[PDB]
Amino acid sequence: FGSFLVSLGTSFVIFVILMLLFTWLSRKSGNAPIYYPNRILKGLEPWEGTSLTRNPFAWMREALTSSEQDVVNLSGVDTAVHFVFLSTVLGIFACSSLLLLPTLLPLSMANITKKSSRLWAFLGAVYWISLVTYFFLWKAYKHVSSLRAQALMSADVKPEQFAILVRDMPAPPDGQTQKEFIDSYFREIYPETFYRSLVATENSKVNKIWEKLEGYKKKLARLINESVAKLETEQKAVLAEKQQTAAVVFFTTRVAAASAAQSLHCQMVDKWTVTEAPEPRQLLWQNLNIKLFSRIIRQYFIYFFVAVTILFYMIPIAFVSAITRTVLESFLPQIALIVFLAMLPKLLLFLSKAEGIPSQSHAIRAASGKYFYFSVFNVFIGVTLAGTLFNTDMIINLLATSLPKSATFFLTYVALKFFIGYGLELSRIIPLIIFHLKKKYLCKTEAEVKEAWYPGDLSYATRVPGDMLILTITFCYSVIAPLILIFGITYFGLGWLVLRNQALKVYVPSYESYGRMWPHIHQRILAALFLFQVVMFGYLGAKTFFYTALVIPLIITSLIFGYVCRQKFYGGFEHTALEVACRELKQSPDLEEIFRAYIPH
Amino acid sequence: FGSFLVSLGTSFVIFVILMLLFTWLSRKSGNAPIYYPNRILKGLEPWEGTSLTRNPFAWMREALTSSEQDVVNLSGVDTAVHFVFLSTVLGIFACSSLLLLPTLLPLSMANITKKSSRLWAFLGAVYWISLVTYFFLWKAYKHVSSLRAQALMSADVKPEQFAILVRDMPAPPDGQTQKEFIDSYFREIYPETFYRSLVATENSKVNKIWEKLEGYKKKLARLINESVAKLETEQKAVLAEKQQTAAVVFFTTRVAAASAAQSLHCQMVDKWTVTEAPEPRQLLWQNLNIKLFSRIIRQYFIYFFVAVTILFYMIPIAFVSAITRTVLESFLPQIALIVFLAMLPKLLLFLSKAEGIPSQSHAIRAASGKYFYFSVFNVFIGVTLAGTLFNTDMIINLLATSLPKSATFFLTYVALKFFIGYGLELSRIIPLIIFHLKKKYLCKTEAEVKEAWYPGDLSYATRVPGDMLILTITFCYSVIAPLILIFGITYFGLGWLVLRNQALKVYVPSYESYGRMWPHIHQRILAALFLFQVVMFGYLGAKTFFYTALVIPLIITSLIFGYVCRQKFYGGFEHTALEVACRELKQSPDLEEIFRAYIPH
Q1: Is the Transmembrane keyword given for this protein (chains A, B)?
Q2: For residues A232 and A251, what is the distance between their CA atoms, to the nearest angstrom?
Q3: CB B247 within 8 A of CB B183
Q4: In whole angstroms, how far apart are CA A580 and each of A150, A549, A600, B194, B199?
Q5: Cα A150 from chain centroid?
Q6: CB B296 to CB A564 under 8 A?
Q7: Alpha-carbon distance A471 to B509, whole Å?
Q8: A contact residues 572-591, partner B, Cβ 8 Å cutoff
């Protein structure tokens, strides 16, 4: 069936490696390795350009010769935690060789029958891969934990070690304006450990004209006046009547700061709630300056709109599933299934702006927070159940009819989603086009000294979820059709290269995050396993083997690991250690650096 | 059927009110109101004895004329939170009059049929009582919250405002013994906010002979030497090799103390875990001095032993259920069902010693923690399903066969559990017997100046769970057989009297707890409601009315309330407010008071 798709896939994926064979030598040599332009202005990496023949050592095995020790200093440890995540999962399928070889040895038809049961080789090997998954994510859980500790004890002085964010202040006015009253409160409740506080603004109206003002003073050589009017009356009115219940304050030492960040303050935790303040580029001020009382109802309504998005998103799955030359008419619904889910990062970003999370670093984990929960019921059980609902004891023959067919559809889909996508992301067609067009245009604006540059963030919004759907497909369809695993293997074995290249090539992190997403994705992969064992119980459930000592210990194990891992590491990550704070203490404190660390502008 | 049980119930319950008509006038006038012996030695309450005729104002309406304003100062606010709990639930069934009157108006037989549907009057009134339950427990949730705040801001100086408990210290020895090393750690990590620390002991071996030594020096006039030997070598050996990873330390001001209690410390929260230290009489030192790494496995195995206790405890339910003069042969299995579950507080105490909770105040909430989870599946669905499994469309006729029969069994059981039990607890047969016998005996020991006294703790271990089972029965069987509600009513309407009397009569609290159990029991009653709506879905599920807008909004409401209440109050209670700490600050600090606040002895 899908022999055509590996044919053409290999064809123009080796053709987009052929365009990379033509890339490195060029006048665009500045645009391709734009990461080091972060380190120094002209530094591209050494000026030899790193070319060999196919450059196997010059990119692939330079990515092999450099290792995780420099991944933390070169770029933020966030890139480190994603790289070590994909390596953990690489082991997750690298063990699976000893599943796939045996299950390939036993591998209208003889098909699968009740007596041979296969489930000491099948379910025994899913016990094998389940066990080694626990081993990998446990091992690397501790590992990335000590990597995070390592990055916190070795971190330099940043303003956020002294920073705490306070959300709900008393609404009522007792006799003074906000500023003086809050400062008097802190003075009464602390023995001179406080510094000063900065209030919050509704400025998103003057911000709507501010970012646009940062463009308006850019339009002078292409309107430089009028906006100062909305910089005047509107902003003054907002300041006079509408500065919210939220603000930020800072303290003398790191220890007092974090300790303050952990504890609740007032008798009613509906008042004076406080969370550790992230970095200005991490936090989102627009979604900040809102009320938690309404945040409850926002979690409510947003969680309703996911319920409308799932059932509204059912119909494309039935559109594509009925399809499975004539396989290019499977192309159109598959690539349209991509570009129909390729908007899902933007859709769940439009939901991820309105949900109320203070930090975009903690917002993204909620963006995949929508994506996983969204993808389980449509791109998997909607697509599987789509294979079942079409082409119809008897229910057993239908499940055993769909699982191979929906397995070839799933395999073909991770083949297009993987093999072609990493090729596109390799030679980055959009930077090479915007190089010609914008270098022809942005020169006309007298900006020729400054390229657009900045390839963009490592962008987990398009990264981790697109890594989630494949996770689900791999796990679930591993047991029923193990061949997907050998082409699930080929996924990360190539990915581990390219993104690593990418990691050291263009992306400069927009997050200094120390692994925020990692515990999220960590309970995520566990959930994915749980789906593999329950859906697996759907597989065996028709096959009728002994399931007591089979399914009940699997679910019991999943449960106890959920408990033990949450109550073990989870809280350990969610906050910063104060021992690292006092033991860090480089003995170079200051004050004025923290004031301009935010500012309204 | 159960007309006999209200006959005799009224008979000897008015006979045990007749023995209270004979009680107050006596030479035992010191033993009956033993609460004020806490206030002063001889003070019994005013020496008029509080007698009227039946003494309606002298106990009942003295309990009416005194109110919750003095419940907090007279005895601990714990008694206050239990009293206000039973008052909340009193409203929970006081609203229900407007359910029971209508559902009594519509009230082999015409029985219940599909078309009239009754569920605008039935399910509409369970929407009515569900709604007003939310209203009562919400209202009184805020109410008891401000009562707790009120008791914390008005509290006097206790040692536990300066106290924090640390559980896991570093296991390895780096060059000094524990004491000096821990103190140096605190010195390095705090700017002289610390005071001094007290280590932990394995002394339960010298304690095994210590409490017994406190008896051995009492045996001198009835062995006063030998134990000092096990006070020597064994204790010294333990001290030399086995003082655990746990200890307690204290700080200069309340604020630093609590703030320290909230935050995690080290990078690995598997090390340096810290919780707010309760009072010595609240905490349990024997279950203290254990490891959390093993506490995980203890929650594991204990939660397995509940799984053996439920299925091992199935058989008495089938023993009693097949029963329903011949009704005294229903007596024997009912009273044996009492005394068979009357050991459950002791059984779940034997489980509640081994589970690892540091505070017996937080342990008891886990004792009912076993009791509710234990009672849902046996005394309710085991007893209901016991009525179903016996006396056998058709399944509909069987559920509609059991629910009335198991409803008369349930009603008869809350009739014996309520009416007779509060009568026994009124005139307290065991104190009046131990008065004669021990006043005849303990005088022979030359202790005649000191009675045993001390009626015992208010003893939630036998209180809150015995209040849980009735909660379940009331809710679940309210819709199918509303008459139980009018005899569920009669439960608390009498209880509100007697225990209140009891509250002001004998019990001196063994807990200074400020309402620890209240959030526990608060999500508990909510769970009970949830069982009423799901089991209710079992009731209507055979009746076949429109259940979309019926059951799905009920479960959605239960969910959103779970979220909003947990994320609203729950964390707000679980710890103490630091604003109350700084705003309390009576400006009379000390040091030496905290050292002897514990001590090994």
Answers
A1: yes
A2: 33
A3: no
A4: 10, 45, 31, 19, 25
A5: 22
A6: yes
A7: 56
A8: 572, 575, 577-580, 582
Q: What is the CA radius of gyration of chain B?
A: 27
Nearest to A525 by CA among A554, A561, A567: A561
CA-to-CA separations, A177 to A170, A242, B333, B347, in angstroms, rounded? 12, 12, 70, 59
* Residue B121: HSE in the Cβ half-sphere, 13 Å Cα cutoff: 14
Q: Which residues of B touch A190 (CB under 8 A)?
A: 255
Cβ <8 Å between B572 and A268: yes
Half-sphere exposure of A410 (CA within 13 A, CB side): 34
Residue A73, both tokens: 């200093």
* Rounded Cα gap, residues A115 and A544, in angstroms: 9
Question: Cα-Cα-Cα-Cα dihedral of B97, B103, B104, B106, to 10°?
Answer: 150
Token output for B172: 């390895």
- Contacting residues for B382 by C-beta, under 8 A, at least 6 apart: B314, B317
* Number of continuous H segments (helices) and E segments (strands) in chain B: 28, 4
Can you tell me the distance from the alpha carbon of A442 to that of A436, in angstroms, rounded to the nearest whole number? 10
Asked if B300's CB is within 8 angstroms of A560's CB, the reply is: yes
Chain B residues touching residue A145 (CB < 8 angstroms): 267-268
CA separation for the pair B514, B144 (Å, rounded):
10
Give the H/E segment covering residue B249: strand B247-251
Q: Which amino acid is at A583?
A: R
Q: So where are chain A's domains?
A: 3-158+291-545, 159-276
Instruction: Tell which phi-psi region holds residue B55, choosing left (phi > 0), alpha (psi between -120 and 50) or beta.
Output: left
Q: Running DSSP on this structure, what letter comes out for residue A448?
A: T
Sequence-distant (≥ 6) Cβ neighbours of residue A105 within 8 angstroms: none
- What sign results for the dihedral spanned by CA atoms B17, B21, B22, B27? positive
Closest CA to A387 of A436, A322, A455: A322
- Long-range contacts formed by B498-503: CB under 8 A, 24+ apart: B498/B422, B498/B425, B498/B426, B499/B83, B499/B86, B499/B422, B499/B425, B500/B63, B500/B83, B501/B59, B501/B60, B501/B63, B501/B426, B502/B425, B502/B426, B503/B71, B503/B75, B503/B79, B503/B83, B503/B458
B268: Cα separation from own chain's centroid: 35
For residues B383 and B541, give the distance between their C-alpha atoms in angstroms, rounded to a whole number.
Answer: 19
Q: B170: buried, middle or exposed (CB in 10 Å: 19+, 13-18, 0-12)? A: middle
- Category of A289 on φ-ψ map: left (φ > 0), alpha (ψ -120 to 50) or beta: left
In angstroms, what is the resolution?
Answer: 4.8
A267 contacts B580? CB cut-off 8 A: yes
Which of B192, A199, A357, B47 lies closest to A348 in space, CA to CA?
Answer: A357
| Chain A residues within an 8 Å CB radius of B270 | 568, 572
User: Which two tokens mark A492?
Assistant: 């990360």
Structure-block tokens of residue A122: 């099948």
Smallest Cβ–Cβ distance between B259 and the set A263, A569, A582 belongs to A263
| Nearest CB to B263 within list A263, A267, A296 | A263
Residues of A in contact with B575 (CB under 8 A): 263-264
- Relative to beta strand B247-251, strand B163-166 is antiparallel
Name the DSSP letter for residue A417.
Answer: I
Q: In 3D, which of A73, A142, A165, A161 has the Cα closest to residue B267?
A: A142
Report the C-alpha gap between B532 and B549 in whole angstroms. 17
- B573/chain A closest Cα distance in angstroms: 8
Q: How many other β-carbons are positioned within 10 Å of the β-carbon of residue B393?
A: 6
Which stretches of A114-273 are assigned E, i.e. beta strand?
A: 163-166, 194-199, 247-251
| Residue A488 to residues A341, A483, A495, B537, Cα–Cα distance (Å) | 20, 8, 11, 44
Instruction: Give the span between the Cα atoms of B453 and B28, in whole angstroms.
Output: 12
- Which method was used? cryo-EM
